[PDB]
Amino acid sequence: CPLMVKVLDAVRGSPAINVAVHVFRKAADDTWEPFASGKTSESGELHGLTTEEEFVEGIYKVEIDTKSYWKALGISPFHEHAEVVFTANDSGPRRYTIAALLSPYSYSTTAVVT
Amino acid sequence: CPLMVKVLDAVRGSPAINVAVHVFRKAADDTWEPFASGKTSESGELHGLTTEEEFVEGIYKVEIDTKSYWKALGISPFHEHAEVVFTANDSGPRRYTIAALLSPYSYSTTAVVTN
Amino acid sequence: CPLMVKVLDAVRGSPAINVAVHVFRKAADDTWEPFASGKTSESGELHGLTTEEEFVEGIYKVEIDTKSYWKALGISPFHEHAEVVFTANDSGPRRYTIAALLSPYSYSTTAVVTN
Amino acid sequence: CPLMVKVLDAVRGSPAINVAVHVFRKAADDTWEPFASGKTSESGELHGLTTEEEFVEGIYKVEIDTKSYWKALGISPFHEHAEVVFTANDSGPRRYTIAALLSPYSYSTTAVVT
């Protein structure tokens, strides 16, 4: 599993459950095209987005549908989504974890590359 | 100044100076139109991006070019940029400050919205 | 103003107003002496905690009373307080801004240190 | 395992390995007294700090020796440590994860309570 995503809720102190996550890869022009997607588990994790064969060098955008998440909880959100854009495999393949921490008017994201 | 950006560097404990910022606005056809752009000052602030007349309702994206910033400091970062997408002025005009805190493999962004 | 604190609220997208802050300094006997205290203004800023003469070298702790803040907003938070402990002025005097971003189960703090 | 700690490095994009973590419980006066301690694993995690029997309601301080961590990497740090102070079991016992994300001049911490 070369790309994992983990989403935490800073208002409730819990994983962010059932959050929709869409991954895009940048194409020959510049257009963003869909690559992978899923919903966070009860642990706030999304595994099996890709396989190593499919996850080649490139620029990727991970867009976290945080707006719908807060909306489901009846909380007023600021962002349309959180968007994490990065080059992967700059030097061949690695394991990537993209972690996001969500609040209504703020978010932070970090990458663990191993 | 209805749209301001403030950027800090968490490695060096300082404002993030001369960071490129581009602001786009979603167009009728679901596409991102250039809206405004600038570079942060020695205080890590970017003022004068727009005006209250030009800053109408819409969905805006503030892209902070964190990759050039880190490279111009000699360091290889993870992110292509730090992005913040939000709907603005939907219930009247508001003043927005977008603050971002940068590290090479992480960033944080917050919006302070006042009336 | 060699020691300033700025506090934001990430739930409401605003400065965190009337937040109590206490600053302690480690004493010769390894104990925390009261140094300064105040409350943030409507801009979430706390100025005038100290003076450059009083702010000598040492290890300081800035305690931000996030628990009272959240309670006075009607909400049950995780942390007793947000704390930041750092050595100051060890290689000459410096100006420090301690910025903190608050959520009920999380907080972030950054220091901006200028010369 | 009712108290876990996880520490990530935002400069290197990796778990923060071999970081010393000291937990204290507040006593009848106010004095802080040692309760638990350990070093982060290769995954940046510290498990087995306590057991449920031992981890009762109270105020706890988790102090993360971030200064020595950066020092070991030859990077100049700002903080003496990161300190996370919280009431636990306010309403009986829970599982607590305290997560910290470290930079030389910044840190963020969040609690996942389950």
Ligand SMILES: COc1ccccc1/C=N\OCCC(=O)O
């Ligand atoms: C803890 O502060 C954060 C800020 C932004 C993104 C992530 C974190 C924290 N932890 O991420 C790791 C979560 C986990 O591994 O369970």
Ligand SMILES: COc1ccccc1/C=N\OCCC(=O)O
């Ligand atoms: C303090 O923690 C932060 C995390 C992410 C982005 C901003 C901050 C803090 N302050 O931003 C305000 C900076 C200022 O207005 O001096």
